[PDB]
């Protein structure tokens, strides 16, 4: 029954507040996000980085410095590792990449000594609110995992269904997206999709229904699914769109992002705690929606 | 034994359907074989099949006298040459002068090289497979087993035709919506077990109507395939678990052993044909009973009847 | 030059009408299209197939069959070979599909005896008019070529440049879309991108400018291009978007047509004459935009 | 010497009661079998599991809890280990499998510190008493080893003949089962088959005769072996049926039990002590006979 980033933010404000640890918090756009997140009751924050620069930027943007702890680390690589150390030892619920390149940030998340590393694979989950589809649309994996095979895709699916579970979708419909809705032994997408689908059928994957392969029209639309005579629980009702690799996943996200005015957020899951990872490309509202999601997950 | 919801569940039902229909014609490849001529006589007495006897006219007529078979009830074609006799029986079939082929006094390899002849043979381009049909005490349902005799190590391309050929036989028997279970060791996808991957991809093909006129659901272990009690205690649900009509084997070892076990450890009525050719092939054996010879004819006679 | 479908259709009305052959014309939705196409003044058409099942539908829909030619062929397959023939034998300027399934219709166009074979690969181009962008956007290949290699991708590009020429873009900006804008041996798409950019440079791909690999956003948006310090004739001004394969392709196509109100049309090129291959999936006005696209490419040549 | 499960059970009662160590005793079917084993004096038992849950089940079935020892361990994974520790350290003579997935039970039996680990490959031995045949047919491996090759098959055979020795078959007749009774380079199982038959001939595999390949029928039936004119000490009189892979052997196994009034039982060997890997779908009598086998073997 949860269909909008507004009902998402509302539910966040309804639960106990959560703490985010900013990795190199000298980022002005990130702190702008931490602030409007703190005042409206979405999330708290610990700022890890250069005390003097952080405090400078905070005055400029009218952000009470006395609202937040600030662990002073001038070194950028150490500032990142300390934000993750804060979360791995449960003094914080989430990490937000700050003024660090996504590579060094992701090494720290992955640190074998103090990181958030797990048994499962790490995966990105993007979420979208469209003018044209009343339910929420989740895309995994659009960012981190390049050419994942079955071993990875199982985990990529479990990680995304955890996120739909948090948003309140009890039993979400997972469509492995391919070019065609049909087993085709020259397209290994569809073979992975058949196998995930048997896996759901037998309870090796739980808390969802998986039915692929499915082209993107068959997964989105009832009219299209009927046009090509595809039946079952997922055609025209897909909550989760499992992308076959990064190339397809990235082109889909950016088509939505650059051709639509769709409210969207994204988080990294699979780790021991949710990770927020924005770019100067993401808007303040995306950054909001992103923290907003990372919160809901961490309270589940 | 709980009661099956099919129309046809036994070989007496199978043979009475054969008899409810226009007589089909069998080309016997090398007819100078008494157990096959015994079989072919009784086929004619009881209205199951007409036969053309292809081979050495002199010995066919001798053996006919020995078994009280009335040679006026049957066209004979004189080919004293064995290799050429098997080929002729096959050519008669491919040129629609008889509906099915039977092996007589020929070695299996020769007969088969004959059926697969490039010029006069029975090739269709899809793969040829053996379907075995059994009537067990313990299940009120015909069981179909594929491939138990021909395909040795089929991969997905072959299993798809082995499945479609299965469904054609079931349809001919009278099962319009058969239930097919790709048998493996387990009921779960295991990367270290190719059978199960193959089972998954056939199952999605069934679901999207790439395979038609059936429900394919696997992998399933044999116990979940037939027993509802086993399906139940193992939490396995769906249209095939406990109700499997067709048992697709992962290979000839699995098929052969299943089959040899049923024959030497039960008294289950059984019959077998080869299909996927342009016409059904009875490939009977010195080991099969007179009853098994007859059932085999009756199966072909139905595949051809469609 | 041209920046809208309204402009494509006006400019198509400028020229002399072009005949379309409908392979199995007994199709309500395609005949509603062929009809609208004649009243507006876009195309005349030969309606090949069952003369009786065609008139029943003609009457139903309110098109006097007198304004059209009819070639009676009651066989599905023969009507489609005959459709393709009326183009191949110079009597019509493009083929569009009807009741024939897609596979049979594609055997019919690529027929060796009377077909439209050119020896160069047959590619599908899709064309988009979006609110967020003023230039027409071209997506190849989205429909036909599944996993093209460098040699099939040269042709894919060359067909698309031919189409963009016919719209009035005399130098199309071609971006080999890829996950990243940097070269990556692990991503075969980036390799083919580099190799393709090189052939543009040496004037081995003529009449256009190819620069890849480019993430879609670098190719779409001047702002995205700038913020990642990627420059050149293409980045942020891309006209043709070269999809690395059909999975990436199919998904960018359906994401546009299901989440936006962008007008679009599609033709298959790399053939002697344009081919329109339309579907229940396609709207009525995208069937039109598609017919109009073929007529512009047929007319320019 | 011993030709029936009644005889197996007479020799078990004949000698001193041994103890099952049930891995997680909160299982009605397992306790129903452990109860009938105590009654008939086939074996004692230590039940390792959730004490409270154990007793209400012992109440539900007529099990007098005073006739068993209960080691209280609520944690399923730890209950599986304690069961094995009791065997490894000689307080019991077998493990049996309760409310655990097979993966968690086998890993516990294969434990490095406290396990029943050994030199030998673990192999399953099934054992049948059929109507049509006067001797016990033993099947190996129908359950544990998936795609064994020559090295594992040698251990599967040795393990196999060791069990036959305890039944009183002094010189058992091992048939490597294949589709055909002749060599064929395109059927790997026949290569392995003559491989193994040479090792018998050379005396490398001792205490048995090994002849193959043999089709199942040649091995079973004097008639079938006579008809295809196959001779030697094994054709027509095979005691042990060495299967080519789990798929083949599971299908013989499940065909035989769901299609016949055969009685059967099975244990895992190779380990330092017999194991009883029970199934959800095993009957009461199979679980019983299976305990009986484990007891008979632990008497050797």
Residue numbers in the entry:
A (entry chain B), D (entry chain D): 1 to 300
B (entry chain C): -5 to 300
C (entry chain A): 1 to 301
The study reports:
Phosphotransbutyrylase (phosphate butyryltransferase, PTB) plays a crucial role in butyrate metabolism by catalyzing the reversible conversion of butyryl-CoA into butyryl phosphate. These enzymes also produce ATP by enzyme catalysis, and thus, they also play an important role in the energy metabolism of the organism.
The CaPTB monomer consists of two α/β domains, which can be divided into the N-terminal domain (ND, residue Met1–Arg117 and Ser272–Lys301) and the C-terminal domain (CD, residue Thr118–Thr271). An active site cleft was formed between two domains that is known to show an open-close conformation change during substrate-binding. The octamer structure of the CaPTB consists of four dimers that are connected in a caterpillar track-like arrangement. The contacts for octamerization are mediated by hydrogen bonds and salt bridges between residues including Glu181–Arg202, Lys198–Asp211 and Asp211–Arg202. The CaPTB dimer is formed by hydrogen bonds and salt bridge of the loop of β13– β14 and helix α8 and α10 between C-terminal domains in subunits A–B, including Lys132–Asp261 and Asp217–Lys254. Instead, we observed four sulfate ions, which were added during the crystallization procedure, at the active site cleft formed between the two domains. The sulfate ions were stabilized by hydrogen bonds with the residues Lys254, Ser279, Ser283, Thr286, and Lys228.
